[PDB]
Design a protein around this ligand. Sequence first.
Ligand SMILES: [Ca+2]
Ligand SMILES: [Ca+2]
Length: 387
Amino acid sequence: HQARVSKFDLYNSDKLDAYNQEFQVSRSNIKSINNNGGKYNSSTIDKAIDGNLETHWETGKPNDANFTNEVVVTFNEITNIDRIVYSARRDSARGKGFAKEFEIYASLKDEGDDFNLVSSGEYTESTRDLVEIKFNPTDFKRLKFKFKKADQNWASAAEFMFYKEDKLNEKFNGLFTDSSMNKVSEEFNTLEKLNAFENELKDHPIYDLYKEGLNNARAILTETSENPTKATLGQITYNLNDDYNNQYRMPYKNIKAIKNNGRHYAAQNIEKAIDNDVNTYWETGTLNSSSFNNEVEVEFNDLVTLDRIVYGSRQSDLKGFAEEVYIYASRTSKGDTYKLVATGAHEATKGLVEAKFEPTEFKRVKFKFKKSKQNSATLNELMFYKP
Ligand SMILES: [Ca+2]
Ligand SMILES: [Ca+2]
């Protein structure tokens, strides 16, 4: 009887309409609405189900020590619903009156106080989010939403939206064994199982959103064992060789994203490590310690086979130079799926250094500063070469 609550990310997708077409209770099925605490001004209760996120209902009576705001939606006919998507008001006072704690009750008739509890839940992350509240699929003629706790008490609702059960969605959420998404569930643990699943999924409205995870599972099933090599590191200048770059350097355009685990100092942000300028650099905000190592992750648009990583520090004084480097590969777009491919060391030097290791396929690369000059970490450039 505990609701599973999460941010409703689908909001920002071009698959939304198509998704709503199949799973949203349509507006022509929502008959009427009322609520026990009136309205403030002309933030009327119809504005809670008017289909427009930019209009809201606000109560005229705030939650106090002795009053709980509730809203009751009547459907045109009995309707099987498993999820509510809800936001608080989204204007100047964004988030005010969010239902931090709520309960959902069903009735199968049009009148009377015969409500039975369907679900309870909380959300503490933010009050400004559009949230998906998921429970056992239940029949409703009337649905009651109680504002058990309402941020700053003046309960509000941009919208309530209602969804039927999405069984293929629920199945897809069982693709992996846990949230680190690094192990395929037994259900899907062969390429043939996975293909069957994908085929099962092809006509679904958000099919294209499931492709990534399916591809991730495919890469995990076909992964080889970790077997890292001692990389060779030396000073190089072939990066100056434009013609050679055209043939052997991975285009900067193949970088999807870069992040790092230690924030940054001042104006030395992480993008400066990949701007094809040896004079700009990223510098961490967090020192290497007994408990911490600086790590940089780069994700690629398209898988790429590389045999060399080229890198440098800030050139002024070589502060943060990677004196010892661990290189990891992942063939997935996300999940804890990195395996160690190489390790090597080099004394701090001006200019750029290559780490050469065995040809490896990368969807993402992690670059770990195992040991670093003055325990800092900087990158003027980070470049990727093919065999
Ligand atoms: Ca609205
Ligand atoms: Ca740079």
